[PDB]
Amino acid sequence: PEFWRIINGDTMKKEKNVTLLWKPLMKNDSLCSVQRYVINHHTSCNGTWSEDVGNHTKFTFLWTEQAHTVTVLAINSIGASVANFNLTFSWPMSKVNIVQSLSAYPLNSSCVIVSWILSPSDYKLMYFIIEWKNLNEDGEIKWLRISSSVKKYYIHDHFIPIEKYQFSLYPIFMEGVGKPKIINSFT
Amino acid sequence: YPLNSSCVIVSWILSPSDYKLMYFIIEWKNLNEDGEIKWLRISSSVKKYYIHDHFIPIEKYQFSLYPIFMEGVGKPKIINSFT
Ligand SMILES: *[C@@H]1O[C@H](CO)[C@@H](O)[C@H](O)[C@H]1NC(C)=O
Ligand SMILES: *[C@@H]1O[C@H](CO)[C@@H](O)[C@H](O)[C@H]1NC(C)=O
Ligand SMILES: *[C@@H]1O[C@H](CO)[C@@H](O)[C@H](O)[C@H]1NC(C)=O
């Protein structure tokens, strides 16, 4: 399952509390079932901590180290999931981003625009995650995987014309997550 | 100019011509999208006629209006993009 993280807490503390969320596997991806869910922790110190979430689809974690690696697996009666995604975050990396511009405009009641230009970087970048939230009401967190090859992408989802949704595009690093560019309303 | 999210007004100024003209022909295309050429027929009399379809304001578009005579075709009047 594609697992995504979110900050819910104060920033002054050296430690950080992180909440994970992932989409439960569907039938074809499950191969007739995916019953337990297992989380394996990892750090730059290489401290591995494996826990079994089970049917629950969210997990809360906290730690004081700058770097920590998460590799969420899935347990099946045949065995654990061989191939799973990854994400790593580092505080010095989290303070730098190379994205320059951001915009949003409803072309329809079911379509909105994302446009962005980026300053050149020095290391490699793999993908972007785009999450948007409504400013009038605090709705559920919604996002979807976006690759780095594409430069301009059509979001196609149901929308309320009177409601104005904030947008925040997050850059991703191999060992870090750069700080997002946050816009409160459509351009 | 884009009046709504899915339309652009087509306005122009027609220079006097010693030879007559019956109608015109409007084209619009995207340089970066490289989409297929679209065309609806426009008479020489109507000034503010326009066609509505789903566009993208950020993208770079290409409109061109040609004058058609009864004996020849005038050179294209090509605009870089909507202002
Ligand atoms: C994380 O998983 C992906 C795909 O399963 C793999 O390509 C990548 O090398 C892994 N990273 C680490 C640090 O294990
Ligand atoms: C809304 O407009 C967009 C413009 O491209 C189009 O792709 C989409 O199908 C339209 N949706 C409806 C429900 O008409
Ligand atoms: C937006 O386009 C025109 C403005 O030129 C307007 O008359 C029309 O009603 C609008 N379209 C929709 C689908 O509301």
Curated annotation (Swiss-Prot), chain A:
It comes from the Eukaryota. Residues 1-90, 98-187 form the Fibronectin type-III domain. Present as a mixture of monomers and dimers. The phosphorylated receptor binds a number of SH2 domain-containing proteins such as JAK2, STAT3, PTPN11, and SOCS3. Interaction with SOCS3 inhibits JAK/STAT signaling and MAPK cascade. It is linked to Leptin receptor deficiency: A rare disease characterized by normal levels of serum leptin, hyperphagia and severe obesity from an early age. Additional features include alterations in immune function, and delayed puberty due to hypogonadotropic hypogonadism. Receptor for hormone LEP/leptin. On ligand binding, mediates LEP central and peripheral effects through the activation of different signaling pathways such as JAK2/STAT3 and MAPK cascade/FOS. In the hypothalamus, LEP acts as an appetite-regulating factor that induces a decrease in food intake and an increase in energy consumption by inducing anorexinogenic factors and suppressing orexigenic neuropeptides, also regulates bone mass and secretion of hypothalamo-pituitary-adrenal hormones. The cytoplasmic domain may be essential for intracellular signal transduction by activation of JAK tyrosine kinase and STATs. This is Leptin receptor. It comes from Homo sapiens (Human). The gene is LEPR. The chain holds residues 643 to 829 of 1165 of the full protein.
Swiss-Prot record, chain B:
Isoform A is expressed in fetal liver and in hematopoietic tissues and choroid plexus. In adults highest expression in heart, liver, small intestine, prostate and ovary. Low level in lung and kidney. Isoform B is highly expressed in hypothalamus, but also in skeletal muscle. Detected in fundic and antral epithelial cells of the gastric mucosa. Isoform B and isoform A are expressed by NK cells (at protein level). It is found in: Cell membrane; Basolateral cell membrane. On ligand binding, phosphorylated on two conserved C-terminal tyrosine residues (isoform B only) by JAK2. Glycans are attached at N4. It comes from the Eukaryota. Belongs to the type I cytokine receptor family. Type 2 subfamily. It is linked to Leptin receptor deficiency: A rare disease characterized by normal levels of serum leptin, hyperphagia and severe obesity from an early age. Additional features include alterations in immune function, and delayed puberty due to hypogonadotropic hypogonadism. Receptor for hormone LEP/leptin. On ligand binding, mediates LEP central and peripheral effects through the activation of different signaling pathways such as JAK2/STAT3 and MAPK cascade/FOS. In the hypothalamus, LEP acts as an appetite-regulating factor that induces a decrease in food intake and an increase in energy consumption by inducing anorexinogenic factors and suppressing orexigenic neuropeptides, also regulates bone mass and secretion of hypothalamo-pituitary-adrenal hormones. Present as a mixture of monomers and dimers. The phosphorylated receptor binds a number of SH2 domain-containing proteins such as JAK2, STAT3, PTPN11, and SOCS3. Interaction with SOCS3 inhibits JAK/STAT signaling and MAPK cascade. This is Leptin receptor. The chain holds residues 747 to 829 of 1165 of the full protein.
